[PDB]
A paper describes a structure:
Polar localization of [name] proteins involves two conserved domains: a central domain required for membrane association that dictates localization to polar edges, and an N-terminal domain required for focused localization at these edges (Yoshida et al., 2019). Furthermore, we use structural and biochemical analysis to establish that this ancient protein family contains a bona fide [name] domain—constituting the closest structural relatives of the Dishevelled [name] domain—and that these domains, like Dishevelled [name], undergo concentration-dependent head-to-tail polymerization. Concentration-dependent polymerization via a bona fide [name] domain allows these to recruit ANGUSTIFOLIA to polar sites, similar to the polymerization-dependent recruitment of signaling effectors by Dishevelled.
Note that no structure of a wild-type (WT) Dishevelled [name] has been determined as yet, although multiple structures of domains bearing polymerization-blocking point mutations have been solved. Crystallizing several of these mutations, we succeeded in obtaining diffracting crystals for [name] (equivalent to D78A in AtSOK1), which severely attenuates polymerization. Strikingly, its α-backbone almost perfectly superimposes on that of DVL2 [name], with a root-mean-square deviation (RMSD) of 1.74 Å. Nearly all these residues are fully conserved, or even invariant, among land plant [name] domains, suggesting that they are critical in mediating polymerization. By determining the crystal structure of AtSOK4 [name], we established that this domain is the closest known relative of the DVL2 [name] domain.
Author numbering: 18 to 109
The structure:
Amino acid sequence: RIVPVVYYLSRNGRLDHPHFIEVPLSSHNGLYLKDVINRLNDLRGNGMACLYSWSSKRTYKNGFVWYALSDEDFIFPVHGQEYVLKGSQILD
C-alpha cells in the first residue's frame, strides 16, 4: 500500500510551497520515518533528506505542534489519514 505525504521544507523560514509525494508502506498499519526517507532517497537522491531534521504535525492544546522524529519512529496522522511533515534545514 502507498500513503499520501505532504512535507514543508524550512530553510530561513519556509520560503516555499509544500511538496506532495506517495510513500510505499513497509507495514500495513503504520508509516515510519524511515519509509518517508527511503522514498525521498529514491526521488531526490540520498543527499537530500539528511539535510533536514524531520517532524510530523500533531494535535496540541488548541492547535498543533511539530513533533520531532527519529528514523526509527512511527508517524501518527493528523485529521483524515493525513500525513504532514516538516523538514527543518540543519545548520552546521
